[PDB]
Design a binder for this molecule. Sequence first.
Ligand SMILES: Nc1ncnc2c1ncn2[C@@H]1O[C@H](COP(=O)(O)OP(=O)(O)NP(=O)(O)O)[C@@H](O)[C@H]1O
Length: 136
Amino acid sequence: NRQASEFIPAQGVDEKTLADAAQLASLADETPEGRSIVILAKQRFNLRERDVQSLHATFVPFTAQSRMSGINIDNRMIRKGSVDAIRRHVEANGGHFPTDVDQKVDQVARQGATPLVVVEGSRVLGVIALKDIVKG
Ligand SMILES: Nc1ncnc2c1ncn2[C@@H]1O[C@H](COP(=O)(O)OP(=O)(O)NP(=O)(O)O)[C@@H](O)[C@H]1O
């Protein structure tokens, strides 16, 4: 299986902020890995999932075809998915993928992890490296 092990902020982003957005944007995904990330911040920050309907917010379902899930709330929007997936989401909003964030995604892969990318609105806040539960 795949689980988030570490997250890194994008260009000018704080690591704590990145872990938090990955957690709430995963509350809406029904994939088992989306729970793996909600754990990742849990052990690192010891925080709890955020109730979207208590904020009158919305969950954004996770689809594998785009490889993306997220969450919407009355003051923010969050999206997370594959690096190619997030780049397309930013361009549709009209945002851009910062070089530093693309570099963090690649170093996540060069390290044998699956780099997901997380954005807020149309800009990437950080990249997430997942360790593989199973490895040959
Ligand atoms: N909680 C999540 N939210 C957004 N994206 C995720 C999440 N978990 C994983 N992803 C990314 O979405 C990709 C999965 O997309 P996809 O290839 O369509 O599913 P899949 O791996 O074939 N499904 P499975 O058969 O269970 O492995 C993963 O490789 C991650 O990079």
